[PDB]
Structure formats: structure tokens, C-alpha cells
Write a protein that binds this ligand. Structure first.
Ligand SMILES: Cc1ncc(COP(=O)(O)O)c(C=O)c1O
Ligand SMILES: Cc1ncc(COP(=O)(O)O)c(C=O)c1O
Ligand SMILES: [Cl-]
Ligand SMILES: [Cl-]
Lengths: 388, 386
């Protein structure tokens, strides 16, 4: 992950100078947050999950919306993300949503992150860090009832139950949450695992002398929060749905568009090869649009000969394999095309839209594999509507 | 591409806040350059291709080696790369290796970059920038004899020949180079296309009254420069081989390693699922290492259940699909593993090394698709040897 998130938000002139860029819909982000809220019980808390620089969309540009919406909690992964959140002015709860090395945890003390622990050694290390900083560190205990086998403590054996109690009883540590996380989008499975979570959490709080009123129980990602409402418990952890990436719930549109421009228009006769490996050959006299985007910007090699882009409101086929920095598109039968026109790689342009399913099928990736790396490799520009 | 290439190099204290990172071998970079030089004829010169922030390795940390090696030319793609090159002190020839929009070209006038043009409109646009800026702009004409069908002008028809002449006869412009580029690692196909490029270049210079002695003819990427030496001409354009990514010439080792650390060690009983979509189930009581790297750092989802990583000098299997920020590894039978230990995702650790072929097979990508995005998504630390 990046060691620091660019403090400045790119402006319009910087956009006219960029080869490729992301346009982030602040209005769509707001609408998605408000729609999500409509399905939450009133006193269920919301922890907005902002890991991977807000799912590629950019923590610094989105935090004013999180604050304006009165969201009490934010989740992050890296120390740089935690720093960006605090530099926004956010004074709410800040949690880490993954296991983090002692190196990482120790260097983050001034950011007041609530760490996520699932092993005795993590508990011992944080207890020592607490005694060294003269603080009481706040932690969430990850349990494995959801079956992620990732950050949590599995309690299906005697040894695991004993380790869980040892995690929960360390000195100079404040257990503020107990959580799990689910691996699949199956409501019957989540209901069965939620019941086990209630049993394991109850048992752990009893064995460790914890006070129910001081613990936040939380298990729900976006899917679970919306499709299994009894799992909302004390707090929910939506990420993807806020950004408009929840496949089960298409009523939250994506907030991101990926764009480039037409650099140049090239006339090619019939029987001309295009791209590395000569994987495409023109069958007719052609006009090709040369775009200054490639796989180094996050537009994969596999898009070639499969994907379409939007130019001047029309779909145009990507031909030849994508190069590191350049993509070639067949505009022979596209009217009105000129150098400098905007090209949509993902998103909408006029009435046409490149769907998430197209991206996934063409790239052979899941959508977040694309957009998280779009966000590290291109500037983000924020759009918001207002009344005139 | 990034709008700005961070000016500061991460320091030693910064690596403790890093979840994952790249280590760049400056010594390996130097030895790749010196080995490449040994195969170049006396009359050619080198233009080091440093697009995509030096193939993910970082322009700012590698430019001192480029200057120490006396390299006279550098190629870039983005304006941010051109700016980083000039800010490093490089005072040689600077070329762009792709077509660039008018707004990009206009923004770059202060950097003294030689643009690459293959259409009449590009020539017209640059001529107007020359008039508006009060200077004569230097350009390279891209020809399509190699068959890339990308940035060049095809001259197999009368229309193409006439457009090529128009490109080369624009006033307020100085044609300093004529080039093409090859799409395949077939030496016999390259030789045939090289002969055609000589014909087409020679015809264009005659018809546009250009003086051969003032024009740099250049056609060779890494592969071509090493495997078709008669194609070296006045200048070569190596990129990948300098960084140790030329599949045909495995004698240039990669300069990049991708690393993380063990965050935690988890005991999971037999018949336990791991990861999203529960694609893995333990077959024995296990000890799993939790690593704070995932696909948002450029370690793809497809690595799960296929790849191995190196921990404490031993290979360990990645189990379950790779999450956005976390990877889980089976260390049940790996001895000596502790939290905080370094993990090699790509590169060498002790005697074992994770090969480029493993990355490509496991990720279902070509190697540069991985490393260019590693470089935008992780800090780079520069290893120097006395
Ligand atoms: C532990 C944890 N909770 C919540 C989330 C958010 O998940 P989603 O994007 O499916 O809502 C993630 C990310 C996660 O790893
Ligand atoms: C026009 C051009 N020349 C040279 C290179 C360098 O290619 P390679 O990495 O195969 O040496 C590239 C990149 C390119 O696009
Ligand atoms: Cl988890
Ligand atoms: Cl080309």
C-alpha cells in the first residue's frame, strides 16, 4: 500500500494534463449512504470501511461526506489510511480491519486506532505496547464463527477456547468489540453462523468477566447488513455497498468512472496487424483511435479484442492486446470522432454504460481487483452537483 | 498514470509503517546496463526507456545510475515521468515513446521533450504549439513498417505516403528522428521488416529533403537490439532488459523484489474453511500465517491456492483466495516461523526464489502487468552495495 496519500486533490487543469483519470461521484456516494441508512435499525452504528484508500476512490476526497453524514466509526487497513482519516478532522472511532504487524501497530499510536486481534501473541504484544505508551489500548477480538479462517481465533476446540479467554483477559488492554466476518453471500449460512457467534461471544464475555454494555458486537459486511437484518447487532461494517459494488444489491450504482482521451486517429489499410503478438488484423480499411492508457494504468492486457469503450456516445471495440501505456480502438464506423474527445473505459457516457459484468468478464478479474489499482495509479477528480 | 512522481525516497524509519514494499537492486540494475552495453556496436547509442515510472522501479531512485552510465537519451510516457527525469538532473535527449494528447504536449513544453508523431493532425498541432511558444520543436516520426499499428504512419499505400510527407514537411518543426517498433520476438520477421523500414525511411527523407546526417534512425527494443544486431542503427530503445524482464534473454536478472511480513500465526483445526468463497478447507490441524498484503497491493486474487511465498528460507503455500488487504499462508510444516519475519512474494530469499514463470502462471498475467502496478501501489526501497 502507498506510504502516504497525496494531500492535494487534483484540480481541472491537472486533469487536462493527465493521460487517464478517475471521476468520483460525490452525489452518488451520498445517495448510496442515505439508501443504506434507510435499511438500518435506528440504533445500529455504522462503521464506514475505507480500506485501500476508500476502495480506490480516495479517503481525502470522501471524508467530508462521511463527517457530514455523522458516521461515528471508520475502518482502515494501512497506517497511511489511518493518518489520512485523522488529517480530515475525523474525531470518531477508528478501527483496523485486518491483522497488522507489531511494527505497524507501534508506529500508529498517535492515531488512536483500535486494533483487531485473533491470537495470544497479538494480545501479549499490544499489552506490552500499552505498558510502554502509558495508554490503555482498545482492541476488537476477532472470532472465527464466520469461517473466514483469517484474522480470528477459532474456538471449536478446547485449546482455541482457552486461547480466546487468554486474548480477552490481558492487562492494560480494553476489549471494546467482539466480531466475526462472513465469506459467502448465503442468507441461510449467515443465519446459522450468526447463532454460533452469539453463543461464542456470550461464552467469551462470561469467561473473561467482560461487561456487555462496554462491548460492541459486530459481524455484518455490506451483504450481511442488507440481506440478513438480524445480524446488524450493535454495529455494521459496510464498505463495497457505499461505493456501489455489492453484486447482490445492484440498487447502489458505482461511484467511479475511469476515463482517458483520444490522442490521435490513424488510417490503416486492410490486412494490417495491431499490437504485440499481432493478435488482430484489419479486414478493411480502418480508422483507429490511439488512447494513452494501458495496463500500467490498470486497463488490463486481456481487454484487447474483447472490451468496448465509449467515444462520442458510441461503443467502440478495443483491438490488439493492450500495451503498457497505449490502447488502440476501432472507430471506423463511429461518427464524429476527433482527437481530444473523452473516452469512458468504465462508467457511463450519454446513454451507454460499460457494466461491471463486462469489466469482470473481459478482464477475468473481480471488480475490486480493478478499481483498487485504478486508484493507486491514476488521479481522482471529485464531482458534485448543486442547484443553480 | 500518477499526476506526480513523489519527490522523496522512503527512509529506513518509513519501512516500519509499510505493510508491503518493493526492494530495488541498484547493483543488479548497473550490471544489466553494463552487460547490455557489451553487445552494442560502436556507432549506436542508448536511449533508456523509463515509462511507467521506470517499469515500476522508480525514476527518481534509478536516474543517478542512468547518469553515471553516460546514457545520452531517456524515453518516457507521461508528463509526470518527464518531470521526474528532468528533476533528477538529466540533461540529455528526452523522448516520448507514445502518442500524447494536445493538452499533454502543451503542458510539457518546459521539459524539452521530443514528441512521437504518426499523423498529420499531430504535426499540425505541434507546429501551432511551436508558433505560440516562440520555438522550433523537435520531433520523431513513427513509421508502421514493424506492423504495430499503434503510434505510426502506415506507408504501404499512396494515402499513407502522402500523409507521411505532410508530417515531415511541417514548418516551425525539426525532424530529429525516424523510427518503427516490432510486435514479435521473431528474428526473421524483424529482419524482413527492418529492410522495409530502411526503404521507407530513405524514401521519406528524400521526398521531404531531410539530411540523413541530422536524423537518428531507431527501431530496436530490448529483444531486437540483442537478437538482431544489424537493427541497432543510430540508437536503440531498451526498456525491459535493463530491469531484467526480457524473456528471450534470461541472462538479465530482475531488479525487483516484492516483500511483506508475517503479522500473526493462527491455529486452525482440520476441516476449517479459509477466505472468501471458502475455496480451501484444511485437511489437517494447521498453523496459518496472516500476511498484510492483498490484491489492492498488487498481489492478485488468483494467487490463492496456487502460489507459494518464501518465509524463513522455506516455500509456503498460499491458501484461500487473496483478500483485498490480507493473504493467508500454510506454515504448518515450516520451521522457525515467527511474527515479524520477512516474506518474499517475488524474488529471492536464501537459496529459494519465486520465478517469473510462477508469477505469470499463478496470476494469469504477463510479468509487467504485475510489476508496473506494484510500483504505483507500494513504496520502493533502494539497495546499494559498497
Ligand atoms: C473484516 C471486514 N469487515 C468489513 C469489510 C467490508 O466488506 P464489504 O465491502 O463486503 O462490505 C471488509 C472489507 C472486511 O475485511
Ligand atoms: C516505442 C517503444 N520503444 C521501446 C520500448 C521498450 O520496449 P522493451 O521493454 O521490450 O525493451 C517500448 C516500451 C516502446 O513502446
Ligand atoms: Cl476476519
Ligand atoms: Cl509504435
Amino acid at each position: 500500500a502507498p506510504l502516504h496519500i497525496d494531500t492535494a486533490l487534483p484540480d481541472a487543469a491537472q486533469i487536462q494534463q493527465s493521460n487517464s483519470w478517475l471521476e468520483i461521484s460525490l452525489g452518488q456516494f451520498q445517495s448510496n449512504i442515505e439508501q443504506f441508512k434507510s435499511h438500518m435499525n435506528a440504533n445500529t452504528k455504522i462503521c464506514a470501511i475505507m480500506k485501500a484508500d476508500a476502495y480506490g476512490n480516495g479517503i481525502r476526497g470522501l471524508m467530508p461526506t462521511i463527517i457530514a453524514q455523522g458516521i461515528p466509526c471508520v475502518g482502515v487497513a494501512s497506517n497511511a489510511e489511518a493518518r489520512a482519516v485523522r488529517e480530515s478532522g475525523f474525531k470518531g472511532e477508528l478501527i483496523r480491519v485486518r491483522s497488522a504487524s507489531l511494527s505497524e501497530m507501534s508506529s500508529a499510536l498517535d492515531l488512536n486506532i483500535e486494533e483487531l486481534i485473533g491470537t495470544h501473541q497479538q494480545a501479549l504484544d499490544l499489552a506490552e505496547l500499552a505498558k510502554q505508551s502509558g495508554k490503555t489500548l482498545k482492541v476488537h477480538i476477532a472470532l472465527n464463527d464466520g469461517g473466514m479462517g483469517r484474522n480470528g481465533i477459532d474456538m471449536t476446540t478446547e485449546a482455541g477456547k482457552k486461547e480466546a479467554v487468554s486474548i480477552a483477559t490481558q492487562p492494560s488492554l480494553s476489549v471494546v468489540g467482539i466480531m466475526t466476518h462472513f465469506p459467502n453471500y448465503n442468507a441461510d449460512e449467515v443465519r446459522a453462523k450468526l447463532a454460533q457467534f452469539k453463543e461464542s461471544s456470550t461464552w467469551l464475555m462470561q469467561q473473561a468477566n467482560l461487561k456487555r454494555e462496554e462491548i460492541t458486537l459486530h459481524v455484518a459486511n455490506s451483504y450481511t447488513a442488507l440481506n440478513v437484518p438480524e445480524a446488524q447487532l450493535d454495529m455494521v461494517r459496510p464498505g463495497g455497498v457505499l461505493f456501489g459494488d455489492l453484486p447482490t444489491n445492484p440498487e447502489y450504482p458505482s461511484i467511479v468512472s475511469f476515463k482517458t482521451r483520444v490522442s490521435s486517429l490513424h488510417h490503416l489499410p486492410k490486412d494490417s496487424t495491431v499490437g504485440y503478438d499481432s493478435t488482430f488484423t484489419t479486414s478493411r480499411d480502418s480508422v483507429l483511435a490511439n488512447l494513452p492508457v494501458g495496463y500500467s494504468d490498470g486497463y488490463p492486457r486481456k481487454m484487447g479484442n474483447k472490451a468496448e469503450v465509449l467515444i462520442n456516445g458510441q461503443r467502440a471495440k478495443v483491438v490488439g492486446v493492450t500495451s503498457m501505456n497505449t490502447t488502440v480502438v476501432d472507430v471506423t464506423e463511429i461518427k464524429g470522432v476527433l482527437p481530444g474527445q473523452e473516452v469512458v473505459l468504465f462508467g457511463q457516457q450519454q446513454k451507454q454504460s460499460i457494466a461491471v459484468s463486462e469489466m469482470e468478464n473481459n478482464a477475468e478479474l473481480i471488480f475490486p481487483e480493478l478499481y483498487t489499482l485504478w486508484g493507486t495509479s491514476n488521479p481522482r477528480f471529485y464531482v458534485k452537483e448543486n442547484l443553480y
